[PDB]
Every structure is written in C-alpha cells, then in structure tokens.
Amino acid sequence: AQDNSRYTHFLTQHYDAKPQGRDDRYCESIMRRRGLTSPCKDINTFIHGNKRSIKAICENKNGNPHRENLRISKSSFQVTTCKLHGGSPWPPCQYRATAGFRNVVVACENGLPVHLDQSIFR
C-alpha cells in the first residue's frame, strides 16, 4: 500500500474545486475551514477547477520537470492566493485575496501532487 496522505493533505491545503467569490472574505473563511489558522499561515494558494488536470501535472500529459525535483504545469489554472495581513501569527487571521490564472509548480510522489511551491505566488 502506498501512503498517499500527503496528496490528500495537498488537496486540503491547496485545492478548492468551485470557490465562487475569491475575495478577502473567501480567504478568511477557507483558511479557517482547512485548518490553516493556528498559527495563521502567511501565504497560501488554492487551485480551482478539476482534480484530474492537477494530477496530470505529475506526468508528461500536463507537466515538465522543474528546477530541483519539482514539476511545472503545462496548463494554466484559476488560483486564489491568500496573504496574511496584520502583525499577529495567531487568530483571528485577516487575509487579502488575489485571484490569478497561470501554471503552477508542485512536487509529485506516486503520480500525485504532495506539495505546492508558494514562491511563484509571493
């Protein structure tokens, strides 16, 4: 049996299929829902759309090798980046939302994404 717990954690931390708003209040709510507010994560990006396209980044179908053992997608994704504001690392956590549309960088293991590289959204 593979341990793919890091894939399901990747989905919890970085996937939201059908977001609606994607405004500041969206970020503040989802960061709480996904357990990312104790302490407040400084930056966190959610990918939207269908799961199969994200998994496909791990193969030639939708990805290329990138830098040191990462992969970069060939398709663009709707994304929302939530950036903490206020000086406290502890809740309540206020966030500013920035919607975007571009390719994403992940790490893959067992053909599944297990890490999002946040650096491209900083």
UniProtKB/Swiss-Prot annotation:
What gene is it encoded by? ANG
Tell me what effect the entry lists for D23G: In ALS9; homodimerization is similar to wild-type; localization in the nucleus is similar to the wild-type; strongly reduces ribonucleolytic activity
Q: What is the effect of changing L36P?
A: Homodimerization is similar to wild-type; causes mislocalization in the cytoplasm; strongly reduces ribonucleolytic activity
Provide the effect of K41Q.
Significantly decreases binding affinity for RNH1
Instruction: Specify first residue, last residue and whole-protein length for the fragment.
Output: 24 to 145 of 147
The EC number of this protein is: 3.1.27.-
Species of origin reads: Homo sapiens (Human)
Q: Which GO terms describe its molecular function?
A: actin binding; copper ion binding; DNA binding; endonuclease activity; heparin binding; peptide binding; protein homodimerization activity; receptor ligand activity
Renumbered ranges of motif Nucleolar localization signal: 32-36
Result, substituting R32K = In ALS9; marginally reduced ribonucleolytic activity; wild type far-UV CD spectra
- Which tissues express it? Expressed predominantly in the liver. Also detected in endothelial cells and spinal cord neurons.
Disulphide bonds in the chain: C27-C82, C40-C93, C58-C108
Q: Which residues form the active site?
A: H14, H115
Can you tell me which family this protein belongs to? Belongs to the pancreatic ribonuclease family.
Instruction: Summarize where tRNA binds, as residue positions.
Output: R22, D23, C82, V104
Entry protein name: Angiogenin
